A paper describes a structure:
Here, we investigate the molecular origins of the nearly billionfold rate enhancement achieved by directed evolution of the computationally designed Kemp eliminase HG3 (7). The Kemp elimination is a well-studied model for proton transfer from carbon that has served as a benchmark for de novo design. Although the first-generation HG3 design is significantly more efficient than an “off-the-shelf” catalyst like bovine serum albumin, its specific activity was further increased 200-fold over 17 rounds of mutagenesis and screening. All HG3 variants have an inactive conformational sub-state, rooted in the original protein scaffold, which was gradually supplanted with a catalytically competent sub-state as evolution progressed.
One conformation matches that seen in the corresponding complexes with a transition-state analog (TSA), and presumably represents the active sub-state. The almost identical positioning of the catalytic residues in the free and the TSA-bound forms of HG3.7 indicates that the active site of this sub-state is already primed for catalysis. However, ensemble refinement of crystal structures for all the variants in complex with the TSA points to progressive increase of the active configuration as the key contributor to the catalytic enhancement. Increased ordering of the Met172 and Met237 side chains, which interact with one face of the TSA and likely stabilize the charge delocalized transition state through London dispersion forces, illustrates this trend. Although relatively flexible in HG3, Met172 becomes better ordered in HG3.7 due to shortening of residue 84 through the M84C mutation, which enabled a stabilizing interaction between the terminal methyl group of Met172 and the π-face of Trp87. The resulting conformation helps to position the catalytic base (Asp127), which samples many unreactive conformations in HG3, in a single orientation with the geometry required for proton abstraction. Furthermore, HG3.7’s acquisition of the oxyanion stabilizer Gln50 constrains the TSA in a productive pose through hydrogen bonding, which is accompanied by ordering of Met237.
Numbering used by the authors: 2 to 303
Amino acid sequence: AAQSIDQLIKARGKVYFGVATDQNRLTTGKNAAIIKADFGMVWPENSMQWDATEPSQGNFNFAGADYLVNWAQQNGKLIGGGCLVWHRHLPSWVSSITDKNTLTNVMKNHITTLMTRYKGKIRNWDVVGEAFNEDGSLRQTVFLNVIGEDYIPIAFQTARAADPNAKLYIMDYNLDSASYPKTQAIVNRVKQWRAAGVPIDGIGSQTHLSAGQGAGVLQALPLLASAGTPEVSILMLDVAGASPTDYVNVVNACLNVQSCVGITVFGVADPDSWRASTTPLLFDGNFNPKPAYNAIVQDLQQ
Ligand SMILES: O=[N+]([O-])c1ccc2nn[nH]c2c1
């Protein structure tokens, strides 16, 4: 039987090798079996996003998120949650809010309700996602436009109050190159926020790579770590082509960075990827471990 990359990465001092999933993955294919055997943390693919959890103001949908949380607890898995404040999965009703006080309270209520429901059960909460433009300026989302840049500090202070046990993360993508301005920009702003006591515990890099981009993460992840958060993480990892070299490079970036607590892949098997044509995950369409998985196993040998 294949070795567990979660157990192997733990044996090297890390916290987890995780995977995104949800109810209908756990009831189909071989996902439940693979997650039970080989992964140590689960994230909700969709079921904790805003459009899934608060489809109208103050009215929440927790059946799907509850299923995942329960399954994780039944199978001794750590749980990540998110994203609490993210423009991409925002219902239209949030986008129409124009009053600063209203959106602030709406955003706080969304954060507090989700985090309170799972209080003490969630290791990591991704509180703010994709807040940056590619040039490193702040993305002009409804939260920035209506609340202003204080929405990020407010989001994290609210999260800390709701569940002090959780590690609070900001996440973004295209943080994979140390020379890309987005990567330095998130570092700059997180240093500034943490100097102001904002409880940003982690930076999570949503790592969607093209073939050959794994090597650059060996420099970009330490740069993210230079922001001084207690933790950084690789999130939503997938790699077009799934070359062993790309994946092992990302893993060794994690191993190289003392503050990097672990890695989360963006699904179990290729056909369930949002870019399945690029066969970018660690298991194929027959749920067989791919060369990249075996290479991670060998790279993590002690
Ligand atoms: O690391 N992930 O795969 C993952 C999936 C969904 C999320 N929502 N917020 N953060 C997330 C991370």
